[PDB]
Amino acid sequence: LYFQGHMTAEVRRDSFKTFWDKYSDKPDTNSMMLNQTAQDLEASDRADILSSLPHLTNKDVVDIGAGIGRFTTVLAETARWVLSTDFIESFIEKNQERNAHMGNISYQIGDAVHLQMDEKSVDLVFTNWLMMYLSDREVIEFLLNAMRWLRADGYIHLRESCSEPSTGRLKTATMHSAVDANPTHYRFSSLYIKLLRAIRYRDSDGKMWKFDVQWSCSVPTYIRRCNNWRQVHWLTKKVPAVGDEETSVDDLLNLFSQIWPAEQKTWDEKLDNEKYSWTDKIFSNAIDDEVVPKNSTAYVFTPRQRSPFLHVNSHLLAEKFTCNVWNVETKEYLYRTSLTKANNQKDQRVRFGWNESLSSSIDYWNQRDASFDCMVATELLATCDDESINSIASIMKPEAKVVLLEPVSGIDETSVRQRMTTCGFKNITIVDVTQESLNAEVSFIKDHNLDVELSGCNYLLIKASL
């Protein structure tokens, strides 16, 4: 019965510690994952996350919210040193017991909100399921702190339950109470990505920094076993932001708390009822089972520059050709809507990732020695340069076939061939699909009652191979 006893940051801070207090009697993987059968998922999930990290030889790592330390255990195998923290005492105690055989782990009991360390004191800030237990202001404050603590070239890993609990709404799998309110913040995936990209931090030497969000990916184990695409994680690098201006906590908070979630909601309203893509009819006359063999993996790239509706229906692709699909998105809000679709369809063959550019996705897949079976893309030539397009082959099998739908103004077929021939393509054919696209786009808009105009561009449908 004290001042603002229902709403202060401390009361809200303590509501999370109280929630986790309920599990301190069970310092086990069930609590860490809030899943009655966490044994089924734990090792595969941990491997999904740990295999996404950079090598840690000679590096200092801080694992914040480490709990019983299932990541700490493996992180300290290669890192020079790991600081492992959690605000639940028994969890840290269980952490110290499991890891009694190791000698390069420091332990701390405390709230992540109050954690303090020297500038440029770590190389990796590792978290997994933590931001969702902080307020919007605390998330921003946490990220500015990570920025302070990281050395240049340093990384931060984050993984959050986005939009819904890991166990969905609501699985008997959950360890959540069916009657108690759940205090957890299930934010949209797009908000995390945008916040990370927005941050500009000036250090004590007066140097500016920004985050390079290397990727956004769904945790594979949660798709395969929980039909959940919204367990989202990101690897993010601290890099110089020459000439940029600082972003304050208040300036970031306005965006993160009000502006962005609002903008996301308008995109949900436009895209969530999408029954098919207007491009389906167009791609139908260029994609066959010679382009997409049965059980192959297709690489799909949809930047959605000219229009949010210009993309590839990856679900229809996977359905009609019995293939797996990786679809790259570059627009945060539109990537989120693809995750929404993925969760409702529950076709595990279809996967999405967010990257800043084509080059970003190519690096990711290069590092993983991927060789996709084909490419289907909208706006490839329109949005990417020769250098990036030429590097697509480094993630394609020999003779992989491609199909491109391209918005153009004047039709310059000779020039289009020369770009693609310069970027390593062969057997190039070009078909003008402007009238077909005009018909299909209008049919699609009227059918979905979108009060919008046509993209208004001409279209080429291109097929080639490498």
Ligand X SMILES: Nc1ncnc2c1ncn2[C@@H]1O[C@H](CSCC[C@H](N)C(=O)O)[C@@H](O)[C@H]1O
Binding site for Na ion (CB under 5 A): 162-163, 188-189, 230, 336, 339
Q: How far apart are the first and last CA of the chain?
A: 72
Least separation in angstroms between CB 174 and Na ion: 18
162 binds, among ligand X, ligand BOG, Na ion, none (CB under 5 to 8 A by kind): Na ion
Least separation in angstroms between CB 343 and Na ion: 9
Which residues contribute to the site for ligand X (CB under 6 A)?
A: 16, 20, 32, 65-67, 70-71, 86-88, 91, 111-113, 128-130, 133
Closest-CA residue to 330 (of 304, 295, 297, 349): 304
Alpha helices in 256-350 (DSSP H): 260-271, 280-283, 314-321, 332-345
163 binds, among ligand X, ligand BOG, Na ion, none (CB under 5 to 8 A by kind): Na ion
Nearer to ligand X among residue 157 and residue 463 (C-beta): 157
- Give the one residue of 371, 391, 434, 465 binding ligand BOG; rule: CB under 6 A: 371
- Give the one residue of 153, 272, 289, 385 binding ligand BOG; rule: CB under 6 A: 289
Residue by residue, DSSP assigns 20-37 as HHTTTT--SHHHHHTBTT
Rounded Cα–Cα distance for residues 321 and 296 (Å): 9
Rounded Cα–Cα distance for residues 137 and 14 (Å): 15
- Please tell me whether residue 296 adopts helix, strand or coil conformation: coil
Cis ω for the linkage preceding 191 (within 30 of 0): no
For position 363 contacting ligand BOG by CB under 6 A, the verdict is no
Rounded Cα–Cα distance for residues 322 and 207 (Å): 51
Least separation in angstroms between CB 252 and Na ion: 20
Sole window of 48-56, 120-128, 315-323, 433-441 interacting with ligand BOG (rule: CB under 6 A): 315-323
Nearer to ligand BOG among residue 51 and residue 414 (C-beta): 51
Least separation in angstroms between CB 24 and ligand X: 8
Shortest-Cβ-distance residue relative to ligand BOG: 289
Q: Site map for ligand BOG, 210-229, x if CB under 6 A?
A: --------------------
Count other C-beta atoms under 10 Å from residue 195's C-beta.
Answer: 23
Nearer to ligand BOG among residue 202 and residue 349 (C-beta): 349
Using an 8 Å Cβ cutoff, are 45 and 222 in contact?
yes
Nearer to ligand X among residue 128 and residue 163 (C-beta): 128
For position 60 contacting ligand BOG by CB under 6 A, the verdict is no
* Contact partners, residue 21, CB within 8 Å, separation at least 6: 88
